[PDB]
């Protein structure tokens, strides 16, 4: 089966027809991407000293 | 012929593979294997049961992948001559990558051998370590690879010719020949004066010979699969790319064994 | 035992995917799905025990 | 060329104003460490 | 949709996933660069109080994450997987499940690298993970084992992609592509895929020797016991220089294409340029120990390597001279990938000149493990590979994604990353020649100014990436409105002078490769029939 | 005024000197075990190893010589 | 009496003879213009390694043909180096005393 | 010949086994399988751990 | 000798090797700045006179004359650059006839210096472990993180060759003022030479990763005159 082609059927994100705004998913992706070293720093700063 | 029954085909010789779930599963199994063998090397989990099942699920996913590729290659029938030359060149480049791992091991041996450290007694082989003499068991399992190459090349040239009773006899006796090689190699390992921890000599010696050991047990599994699909009439007289693949592999394994054997058993003692 | 053209006539003439198209391919994939799900979900419950640092109970 | 204002003059007129602005953009693409050193307390500011 | 994104043996829908992990890991790596340069902003124990092991963990995470999970995916994996079948007319690549498993064994290397930085304080060695700093006596724990299992998985991914690329442009070319008629990015991906399978076997052999003398009691680099740690430096840097030549050669291909198409001129001597690039590839193996001028080599072999690294330096010079020759005499349309292409030339020539200042084995004794080296590679790696990455995205994604971006936001993003990254790595040279060593948490408080200037710059270089994230969002939800409502640029190749508008609407795209003739987002079976060429 | 030391040996002119110390030590123990048990101008070797290689190496090699697990054996009977 | 100099380089002559053996087998087998490249390469490789490991035992017979002429080596070259190491100490400290 | 030699060195009492060198029998960390001092093909006749008297 | 805030040049000369390194770096930068200036000038001239160019000379794609001149010019400049670095590399390993020797063996997060040229007529070798002063016991004028409670002290105007090694993780003996930088790997001794031409202090740091205490690992070398060094060595 050849999957049908369009302007928004090339990416894994669904953008147009949703229930939530797209900014939620699009900025939460880079929120968890930008906050994985912060949670590494937190789990490393509770293991040795304080914080 | 008619345009109407020419446009009902592929329009280019190359392969169009249907979406198959064996990159994702074997990648899952590779992740589980890596994490479990990083986790059991420090006593976090109790036994080696979990690295055993991780290695087993990797093995059975990859053999299901090879089941899918033999079904697609000889049942659905897509491996035309362009795809055959493609997978042939791909296997050639993969084996060119394997021999560079062997070259890195030989670099380790040469660098710690021809400039020996002052803690080894400044002599290669080091003091006290009774080195393996190259003329007893190394001579048998360096002539057995040449005999294996000779019988696998006449089994190949009998497969191209047309006789079945010769092209099957050569494959059966090369399988039993190299498994006799593997068993006497294990016999050589289980009575040797040095272990893998005894100095740097035992370390790099067992690293090189053990990598060649694992390579030929993988070759023996490949040749068992090839003998099964030669008995079950999959291999033809002009479309045996999965057998030319393994004879290229066993001949380059023979020559890398002779390199490893010469500089690991004659010059290095 | 020269059973390649019958397998080809079966394998071309179906709609099911390729890893489910064989007759005896039910005995190869259900226990595989079971043991694969077990074998890959199981270190992800031992990883927080490693993050907390508590080792095994061996010896 | 043969007839017209000479090529030396008509390309000097094009390029001589370009040398000073090249020197400006290079003196501010490599010379801003001088401008940040000039205001700090190491120069007894 | 599960069979289109999880099984998905189609080289167009694997490159998007490559790019998604690329932007995810690049965000994580620049969060680590922000945390590093935020802690190094002032002497005395800043934000992470004490705890130098955490800083070592953060710097190895930044280095290895941003090398092996942003630059190598978003240059080799993503761009090669989307464009190498789409420039030579293959319907898509050979061995499709191989470049599906390459992508799908990337993020498990990522998750084991992430969970390596949590267990038993952590792997801190730097990305050049050395013994006996990483052997079990001086570094105990299962951390660096997961940290190098990540390198095993990324190594396997890149080699499988290399074999995939090599066979798919050695056999499935279109009807008229001869052995020397390919566009130069195909040649870059070609030669890079050769250097991968000629180099990284040695890497994986050396690092699995490191693993089985950590845990399996062998003695490759454990020195009291026979071995030597110099053998790891040899076995690592034999990959370590071909790795960055792998990371920079598709950058040369991308920059060649964008300066060819934004100046309305073919590249000056494409055959001599591809000969220079191929000789750079086959010569980059012979200079692997210019990172080891200090450890105790003889002056004779040091003389050989400082002879050979300058012959490494010359064909990059003739490539940059051909770039100046092919932008000379053009009709340069200064759009946002052409701006990145223009900045790459200057900001890589600067790093290459300080690199040949480093390449003298005489002069490397004053500069080794010193912030001069950081100023060199954070030019030629950062500005080089990522200005080529931005000049790849801003030039190709209107064709791939099919949604036109905003133009003025792209130009403020370029000028913000240009200013705010030129202010970081330029004081690193003064920190280097004044005497600051590498990998210190912080420093003796003499040179307290240039670190503060670099830290006030890194916030600009992070804010420009936040604006790039907003550019991605504004492209994804306002693509068609940026097509219509006159916020973007629509034609990358302008109409020529004496050509009418009614005549430009006949021949819209004057390309020289296939990619700008396919429709925005292209069909899943683009070349049903082969694409002929004479 | 004087500050004399080992000078420059012609056998080992490289940057490394580990073979130079190990050979000078093993040849000190090869002079003073063989020709005469102690009276000599082979105090040159003693001067050389005690000038060149560190005290932890000398202590490790002397305890290895006492236990008999020395690497390059010194022709002892 | 030539055994000394061209048995010091055993593993140079063996390796050069292996390369020349594969070349002189390949140029023989490739003149047959009917086969695949791969079959020619593996047959040449087999002939080459057979003659090479056949020469490896001829060098063993030659190795004890050298060993009767120079008994118990690796241990009396060490003492020649030791005599040159003791002379360099005595020659030096005698002029240290009288210089 | 090697089999009769291994039967010769079977009955040797273990303190008569020679004290051998620093590089032989290195143990950085203990082996995670077995008792702690046992490799894969560890023959208990030819590869004894002397434990330094 | 010591670093200075907002400096953009070398820690200044002490040794002939560092003087040669400074002269060589200025010669290399003098040959590099022509190339940087003409590359920046070519880029500026092109992008500010061909942006306002409406047509493009698309029929200029090769020329052999200018191609071979821009491929034979970097070979010439790189030969002129490589011509004195061979002289420096082959003279900075010339350690013929040094006066005295030092061992500088580096442990975990400190150094241990030892002199064993036997003119200390107490009889013994002299060693001292050379820990960093921890940064709360500093007393009103002491340079932070690169001071030392027990300095190494060397003489002026004698060639001194010191070997270096470790007992652990690979360290580096690195002083940028004396121009000396050599990796102390735990397996081998590595020797480098020096001729310090003036009295005074010289500071340096470890320049290889050691682990947690990489920053807290300095080198302090006071160079005094020869009678004061003889008095110090006899007294200590
Ligand atoms: C990929 C290579 C790479 C890049 C780009 C960078 C960029 C940065 N690095 Fe560095 N760094 C290294 C690799 C890199 N680094 C290596 C190998 C070391 C040596 C480690 C060691 O030896 O111990 C090192 C060391 C190092 C040091 C020296 C510390 C020391 O060793 O003492 C510092 C200090 O400032 C630092 C921080 C930063 C910061 C703030 C940036 C900023 O420039 C980050 C900002 C970057 C961007 C904004 C780029 C855009 C990002 C995207 C995600 C774009 C997405 C686009 C597409 C996918 C098309 N890293
Ligand atoms: C992206 C990979 C990459 C690339 C392309 C380069 C480019 C070069 N590098 Fe770099 N380098 C690194 C990656 C790279 N480097 C890394 C990762 C480190 C740190 C490793 C660590 O952790 O220790 C490092 C540090 C480093 C070292 C190690 C120093 C040390 O650690 O002690 C050396 C040594 O020779 C070096 C030299 C060079 C040279 C001569 C080039 C040349 O290829 C540059 C070529 C470009 C030009 C030459 C300019 C353009 C040419 C002209 C304008 C013509 C005229 C020029 C001349 C006549 C010279 N750099
Ligand atoms: C780990 C276990 C390794 C087991 C290897 C099994 C090999 C059998 C594959 C097969 O049988 O593949 C059959 C196919 C095609 O067969 P054909 O077209 O010749 O048949 C046509 C009849 N008319 O060959 C190939 O495409 C090449 C396969 C190479 C696979 C190499 C894998 C190496 C893994 C190393 C890790
Ligand atoms: C290029 C454009 C961006 C450059 C930004 C550089 C700012 C670096 C900085 O932050 O400057 C730091 C300096 C030194 O201040 P200090 O160390 O005495 O302060 C100790 C802690 N406050 O403060 C100034 O000089 C203020 C004037 C800035 C002038 C910038 C001119 C740029 C040309
Ligand atoms: C480890 C890396 C192993 C690479 C093997 C290269 C074989 C080249 C080839 O011929 O690959 C042929 C096939 C893949 O081909 P395909 O199904 O995409 O081909 C479609 C028809 N043209 O076997 C493989 O590669 C499978 C290799 C992975 C097996 C598990 C390894 C786990 C580690
Ligand atoms: C340094 C500057 C630092 C401070 C910058 C602050 C913001 C300025 C906005 C500029 C602007 O807005 O530029 C917009 C204008 C566009 O004008 P136009 O010719 O299209 O006009 C046509 C009217 N119809 O300039 C340009 O694109 C041309 C200049 C390109 C600059 C590329 C720089 C690449 C990096 C440097 C490469 C080497 C050059 C330097 C060394 C010689
Ligand atoms: C991907 C990277 C590929 C590069 C691989 C480099 C070499 C690794 C394998 C060497 C085999 C050594 C051997 O087979 O060693 C044999 C020894 C047993 O010998 P013994 O001491 O009992 O002898 C006793 C004499 N009386 O097993 C060991 O103790 C260590 C085993 C470690 C686990 C196997 C190797 C793990 C890595 C395999 C990676 C494969 C991919
Ligand atoms: C090329 C870039 C040239 C411009 C640099 C601007 C520096 C401005 C500044 O910050 O200079 C400030 C310093 C002040 O330091 P001081 O010694 O007075 O400190 C005393 C504090 N109490 O001025 C100088 O020392 C010399 C004057 C500038 C010399 C220019 C740099 C020379 C070496 C080149 C280093 C760059 C190498 C790049 C390698 C590719
Ligand atoms: Cu010692 Cu860093
Ligand atoms: Cu390099
Ligand atoms: Mg270093």
């Amino acid at each position: 089966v050849h999957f049908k082609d369009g302007v928004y059927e090339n990416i894994p994100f669904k953008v147009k027809g949703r229930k939530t705004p797209y900014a939620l998913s699009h900025f939460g992706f880079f929120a968890i991407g930008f906050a994985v070293p912060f949670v590494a720093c937190y789990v490393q700063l509770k293991k040795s000293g304080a914080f | 012929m008619t345009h109407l029954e020419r446009s009902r085909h592929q329009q280019h010789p190359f392969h169009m593979v249907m979406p198959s779930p064996w990159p994702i599963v074997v990648s899952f199994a590779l992740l589980s294997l890596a994490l479990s063998t990083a986790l059991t090397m420090h006593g976090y989990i109790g036994n080696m049961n979990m690295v055993y099942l991780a290695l087993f699920v990797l093995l059975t996913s990859s053999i299901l992948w090879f089941r899918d590729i033999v079904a697609e290659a000889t049942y659905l029938g897509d491996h035309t001559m362009a795809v055959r030359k493609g997978i042939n060149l791909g296997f050639l480049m993969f084996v060119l990558s394997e021999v560079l791992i062997f070259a890195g091991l030989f670099w380790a041996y040469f660098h710690s051998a021809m400039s020996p450290d002052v803690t080894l007694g400044a002599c290669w082989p080091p003091v006290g370590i009774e080195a393996v003499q190259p003329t007893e068991l190394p001579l048998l399992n360096t002539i057995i690879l040449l005999s294996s190459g000779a019988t696998v090349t006449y089994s190949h040239h009998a497969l191209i010719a047309g006789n079945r009773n010769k092209a099957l006899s050569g494959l059966l006796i090369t399988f039993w020949l190299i498994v006799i090689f593997v068993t006497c190699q294990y016999i050589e390992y289980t009575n040797a004066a040095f272990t893998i921890s005894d100095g740097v000599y035992g370390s790099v010696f067992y690293a090189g010979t053990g990598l060649h050991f694992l390579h030929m047990v993988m070759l023996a599994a490949m040749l068992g699969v090839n003998y099964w699909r030669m008995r079950n009439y999959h291999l033809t007289a002009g479309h045996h790319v999965g057998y030319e693949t393994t004879i290229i592999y066993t001949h380059v394994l023979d020559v890398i064994w002779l390199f490893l054997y010469v500089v690991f058993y004659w010059w290095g003692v | 035992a020269n059973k390649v053209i019958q397998l080809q006539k079966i394998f071309q003439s179906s709609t099911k995917p390729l890893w489910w198209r064989h007759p005896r391919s039910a005995l190869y994939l259900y226990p595989f799905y079971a043991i694969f799900a077990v074998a890959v979900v199981t270190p992800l419950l031992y990883i927080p025990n490693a993050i907390r640092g508590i080792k095994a109970k061996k010896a | 060329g043969r007839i017209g204002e000479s090529w030396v003059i008509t390309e000097g007129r094009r390029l001589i104003p370009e040398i000073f602005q090249w020197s400006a953009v290079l003196s501010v693409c490599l010379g801003w460490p001088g401008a940040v050193y000039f205001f700090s307390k190491a120069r007894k500011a | 949709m599960v069979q289109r994104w999880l099984y998905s043996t189609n080289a167009k829908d694997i490159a998007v996933l490559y790019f998604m992990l690329a932007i995810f890991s690049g965000m994580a790596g620049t969060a680590m660069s922000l945390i590093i340069r935020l802690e190094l902003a002032a002497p005395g124990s800043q934000y992470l109080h004490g705890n130098s092991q955490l800083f070592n963990v953060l710097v190895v995470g930044h280095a290895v994450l941003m090398i092996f999970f942003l630059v190598m995916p978003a240059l080799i994996g993503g761009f090669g997987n989307y464009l190498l079948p789409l420039m030579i007319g293959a319907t898509d690549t050979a061995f499709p499940r191989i470049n599906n498993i390459a992508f799908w064994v990337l993020p498990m290397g990522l998750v084991c690298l992430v969970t390596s930085t949590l267990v038993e304080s952590g792997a801190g060695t730097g990305w050049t993970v050395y013994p006996p700093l990483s052997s079990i006596q001086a570094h105990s724990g299962p951390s660096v084992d997961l940290a190098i299992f990540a390198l095993h998985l990324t190594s396997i991914s890149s080699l499988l992609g290399a074999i995939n690329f090599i066979v798919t442009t050695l056999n499935m070319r279109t009807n008229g592509m001869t052995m020397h008629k390919l566009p130069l990015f195909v040649w870059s991906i070609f030669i890079t895929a050769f250097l991968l399978l000629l180099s990284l076997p040695v890497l994986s052999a050396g690092i699995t020797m490191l693993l089985l003398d950590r845990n399996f009691n062998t003695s490759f680099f454990e020195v009291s016991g026979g071995g030597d740690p110099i053998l790891y430096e040899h076995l690592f840097w034999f990959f370590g220089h071909p790795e960055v030549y792998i990371l920079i050669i598709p950058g040369f291909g991308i920059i060649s294409h964008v300066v060819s198409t934004y100046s309305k001129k073919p590249v000056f001597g494409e055959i001599s340029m591809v000969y220079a690039m191929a000789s750079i590839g086959l010569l980059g193996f012979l200079v692997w120990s210019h990172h080891m001028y200090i450890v105790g080599l003889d002056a004779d072999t040091r003389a050989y390597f400082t002879s050979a690294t300058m012959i490494i330096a010359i064909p990059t010079g003739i490539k940059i001279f051909s770039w100046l020759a092919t932008i000379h005499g053009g009709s340069i349309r200064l759009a946002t990938p052409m701006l990145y292409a223009i900045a790459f030339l200057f900001l890589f020539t600067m790093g290459g000149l300080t690199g040949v200042a480093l390449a003298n084995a005489s002069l490397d004794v004053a500069f080794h493990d010193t912030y001069y080296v950081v100023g060199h590679f954070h030019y030629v790696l950062s500005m080089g590979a990522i200005f080529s990455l931005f000049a790849g995205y801003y030039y190709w994604s209107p064709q791939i994604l099919g949604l036109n971006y905003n133009e003025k936001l792209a130009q403020i993003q370029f000028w913000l990353i240009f200013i705010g990254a030129n202010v970081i790595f330029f004081p690193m040279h003064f920190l280097g020649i004044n005497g600051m060593p590498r990998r210190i948490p912080d420093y003796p408080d003499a040179f307290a100014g240039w670190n503060y200037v670099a830290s006030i710059g890194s916030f600009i270089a992070t804010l420009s990436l936040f604006l790039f994230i907003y550019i991605l969002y504004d492209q994804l939800v306002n693509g068609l409105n940026n097509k219509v409502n006159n916020k973007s640029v629509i034609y990358n190749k302008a109409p020529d002078f004496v050509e009418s508008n009614t005549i430009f609407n006949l021949n819209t795209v004057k390309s020289s490769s296939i990619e700008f003739l396919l429709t925005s987002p292209p069909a899943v079976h683009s070349f049903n029939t082969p694409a002929v060429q004479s | 005024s004087p500050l004399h030391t080992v000078g420059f040996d012609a056998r080992f002119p490289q940057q490394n000197q580990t073979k130079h110390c190990w050979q000078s030590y093993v040849d000190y123990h090869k002079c003073v075990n063989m020709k005469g048990e102690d009276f000599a101008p082979c105090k040159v070797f003693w001067k050389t190893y005690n000038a060149l290689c560190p005290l932890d190496w000398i202590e490790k090699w002397d305890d290895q010589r006492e236990k008999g697990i020395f690497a390059g054996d010194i022709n002892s009977d | 009496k030539f055994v000394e100099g061209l048995s010091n380089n055993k593993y140079k002559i063996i390796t050069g003879a292996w390369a020349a053996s594969l070349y002189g087998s390949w140029v023989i087998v490739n003149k047959d213009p009917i086969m695949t490249k791969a079959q020619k390469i593996v047959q040449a490789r087999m002939y080459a390694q057979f003659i090479t490991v056949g020469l490896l035992l001829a060098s063993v017979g030659l190795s004890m043909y050298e060993n009767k002429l120079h008994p118990n080596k690796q241990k009396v070259n060490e003492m020649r180096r030791w005599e040159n190491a003791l002379r360099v100490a005595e020659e030096e400290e005698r002029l240290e005393k009288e210089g | 010949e090697h089999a009769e030699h291994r039967e010769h060195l079977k009955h040797v009492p273990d303190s008569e086994w020679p004290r051998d060198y620093e590089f032989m029998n290195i143990r950085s960390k203990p082996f995670f399988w077995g008792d702690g001092d046992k490799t894969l093909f560890w023959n208990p006749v030819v590869n004894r751990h002397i434990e330094h008297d | 000798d010591v670093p200075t805030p907002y400096a953009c040049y070398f820690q200044d000369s002490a040794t002939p090797n560092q003087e040669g390194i400074l002269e060589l770096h200025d010669n290399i930068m003098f040959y590099l700045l022509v190339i940087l200036g003409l590359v920046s000038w070519m880029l500026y001239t092109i992008v500010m006179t061909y942006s306002k160019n409406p047509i493009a000379y698309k029929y200029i794609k090769h020329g052999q004359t200018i191609e071979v001149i821009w491929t034979i010019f970097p070979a010439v400049i790189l030969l002129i650059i490589a011509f004195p670095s061979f002289i420096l590399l082959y003279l900075c390993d010339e350690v013929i006839s040094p006066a005295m020797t030092i061992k500088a063996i580096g442990y975990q997060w400190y150094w241990k210096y030892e002199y064993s040229d036997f003119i200390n007529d107490s009889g013994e070798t002299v060693e001292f472990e050379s820990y960093v002063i921890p940064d709360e016991l500093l007393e009103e004028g002491q340079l932070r993180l690169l001071d030392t409670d027990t300095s190494m002290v060397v003489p002026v105007d004698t060639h001194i060759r010191f070997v270096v090694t470790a007992a652990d993780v690979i360290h580096d003996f690195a002083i940028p003022s004396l121009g000396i930088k050599v990796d102390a790997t735990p397996g081998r001794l590595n020797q480098v030479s020096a001729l310090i031409q003036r009295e005074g202090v010289f500071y340096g740091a470890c320049s290889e990763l050691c682990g947690t205490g990489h920053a807290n690992m300095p080198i302090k070398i006071e160079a005094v005159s020869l009678p004061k060094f003889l008095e110090w060595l006899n007294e200590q």
Side-chain angles (χ1 to χ4, degrees), chain I residues 140-145:
Chain I
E140 291 295 326
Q142 260 168 6
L143 280 79
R144 189 189 89 91
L145 214 70

mmCIF file with all atom_site columns, all heavy atoms in Angstrom, chain I residues 140-145:
data_model
loop_
_atom_site.group_PDB
_atom_site.id
_atom_site.type_symbol
_atom_site.label_atom_id
_atom_site.label_alt_id
_atom_site.label_comp_id
_atom_site.label_asym_id
_atom_site.label_entity_id
_atom_site.label_seq_id
_atom_site.pdbx_PDB_ins_code
_atom_site.Cartn_x
_atom_site.Cartn_y
_atom_site.Cartn_z
_atom_site.occupancy
_atom_site.B_iso_or_equiv
_atom_site.pdbx_formal_charge
_atom_site.auth_seq_id
_atom_site.auth_comp_id
_atom_site.auth_asym_id
_atom_site.auth_atom_id
_atom_site.pdbx_PDB_model_num
ATOM 1  N N   . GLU I 1 140 ? 46.078 36.508 53.014 1.00 0.00 ? 140 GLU I N   1
ATOM 2  C CA  . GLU I 1 140 ? 46.242 37.920 52.636 1.00 0.00 ? 140 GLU I CA  1
ATOM 3  C C   . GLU I 1 140 ? 47.382 38.140 51.642 1.00 0.00 ? 140 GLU I C   1
ATOM 4  O O   . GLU I 1 140 ? 48.403 38.763 51.933 1.00 0.00 ? 140 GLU I O   1
ATOM 5  C CB  . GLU I 1 140 ? 46.402 38.802 53.877 1.00 0.00 ? 140 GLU I CB  1
ATOM 6  C CG  . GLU I 1 140 ? 45.125 38.896 54.708 1.00 0.00 ? 140 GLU I CG  1
ATOM 7  C CD  . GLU I 1 140 ? 43.982 39.587 53.969 1.00 0.00 ? 140 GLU I CD  1
ATOM 8  O OE1 . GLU I 1 140 ? 44.248 40.516 53.176 1.00 0.00 ? 140 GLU I OE1 1
ATOM 9  O OE2 . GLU I 1 140 ? 42.815 39.191 54.176 1.00 0.00 ? 140 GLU I OE2 1
ATOM 10 N N   . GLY I 1 141 ? 47.180 37.589 50.458 1.00 0.00 ? 141 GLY I N   1
ATOM 11 C CA  . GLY I 1 141 ? 48.122 37.679 49.365 1.00 0.00 ? 141 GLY I CA  1
ATOM 12 C C   . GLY I 1 141 ? 48.772 36.340 49.126 1.00 0.00 ? 141 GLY I C   1
ATOM 13 O O   . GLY I 1 141 ? 49.823 36.017 49.685 1.00 0.00 ? 141 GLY I O   1
ATOM 14 N N   . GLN I 1 142 ? 48.144 35.589 48.228 1.00 0.00 ? 142 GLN I N   1
ATOM 15 C CA  . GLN I 1 142 ? 48.516 34.254 47.786 1.00 0.00 ? 142 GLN I CA  1
ATOM 16 C C   . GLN I 1 142 ? 47.616 33.970 46.601 1.00 0.00 ? 142 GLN I C   1
ATOM 17 O O   . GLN I 1 142 ? 46.399 34.150 46.695 1.00 0.00 ? 142 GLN I O   1
ATOM 18 C CB  . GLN I 1 142 ? 48.323 33.198 48.876 1.00 0.00 ? 142 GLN I CB  1
ATOM 19 C CG  . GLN I 1 142 ? 49.589 32.789 49.603 1.00 0.00 ? 142 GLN I CG  1
ATOM 20 C CD  . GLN I 1 142 ? 49.297 31.969 50.838 1.00 0.00 ? 142 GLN I CD  1
ATOM 21 O OE1 . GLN I 1 142 ? 48.151 31.613 51.102 1.00 0.00 ? 142 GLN I OE1 1
ATOM 22 N NE2 . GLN I 1 142 ? 50.336 31.672 51.611 1.00 0.00 ? 142 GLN I NE2 1
ATOM 23 N N   . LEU I 1 143 ? 48.190 33.545 45.489 1.00 0.00 ? 143 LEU I N   1
ATOM 24 C CA  . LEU I 1 143 ? 47.413 33.436 44.267 1.00 0.00 ? 143 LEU I CA  1
ATOM 25 C C   . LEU I 1 143 ? 46.506 32.211 44.330 1.00 0.00 ? 143 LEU I C   1
ATOM 26 O O   . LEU I 1 143 ? 46.942 31.123 44.709 1.00 0.00 ? 143 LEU I O   1
ATOM 27 C CB  . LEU I 1 143 ? 48.349 33.377 43.065 1.00 0.00 ? 143 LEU I CB  1
ATOM 28 C CG  . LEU I 1 143 ? 48.974 34.663 42.506 1.00 0.00 ? 143 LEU I CG  1
ATOM 29 C CD1 . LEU I 1 143 ? 50.167 35.155 43.316 1.00 0.00 ? 143 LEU I CD1 1
ATOM 30 C CD2 . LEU I 1 143 ? 49.356 34.475 41.048 1.00 0.00 ? 143 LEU I CD2 1
ATOM 31 N N   . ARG I 1 144 ? 45.234 32.399 43.979 1.00 0.00 ? 144 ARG I N   1
ATOM 32 C CA  . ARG I 1 144 ? 44.223 31.369 44.200 1.00 0.00 ? 144 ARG I CA  1
ATOM 33 C C   . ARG I 1 144 ? 44.393 30.218 43.223 1.00 0.00 ? 144 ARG I C   1
ATOM 34 O O   . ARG I 1 144 ? 44.667 30.439 42.042 1.00 0.00 ? 144 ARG I O   1
ATOM 35 C CB  . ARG I 1 144 ? 42.824 31.957 44.052 1.00 0.00 ? 144 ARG I CB  1
ATOM 36 C CG  . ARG I 1 144 ? 41.709 31.015 44.481 1.00 0.00 ? 144 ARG I CG  1
ATOM 37 C CD  . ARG I 1 144 ? 40.343 31.564 44.117 1.00 0.00 ? 144 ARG I CD  1
ATOM 38 N NE  . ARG I 1 144 ? 39.929 31.163 42.778 1.00 0.00 ? 144 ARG I NE  1
ATOM 39 C CZ  . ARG I 1 144 ? 39.225 30.069 42.511 1.00 0.00 ? 144 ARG I CZ  1
ATOM 40 N NH1 . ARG I 1 144 ? 38.857 29.258 43.492 1.00 0.00 ? 144 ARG I NH1 1
ATOM 41 N NH2 . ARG I 1 144 ? 38.891 29.785 41.261 1.00 0.00 ? 144 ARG I NH2 1
ATOM 42 N N   . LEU I 1 145 ? 44.298 28.989 43.746 1.00 0.00 ? 145 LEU I N   1
ATOM 43 C CA  . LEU I 1 145 ? 44.218 27.720 43.017 1.00 0.00 ? 145 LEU I CA  1
ATOM 44 C C   . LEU I 1 145 ? 45.503 27.335 42.284 1.00 0.00 ? 145 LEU I C   1
ATOM 45 O O   . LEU I 1 145 ? 45.585 26.231 41.737 1.00 0.00 ? 145 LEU I O   1
ATOM 46 C CB  . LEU I 1 145 ? 43.043 27.729 42.026 1.00 0.00 ? 145 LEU I CB  1
ATOM 47 C CG  . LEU I 1 145 ? 42.297 26.420 41.766 1.00 0.00 ? 145 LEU I CG  1
ATOM 48 C CD1 . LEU I 1 145 ? 41.501 26.031 42.978 1.00 0.00 ? 145 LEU I CD1 1
ATOM 49 C CD2 . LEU I 1 145 ? 41.386 26.527 40.563 1.00 0.00 ? 145 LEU I CD2 1
#
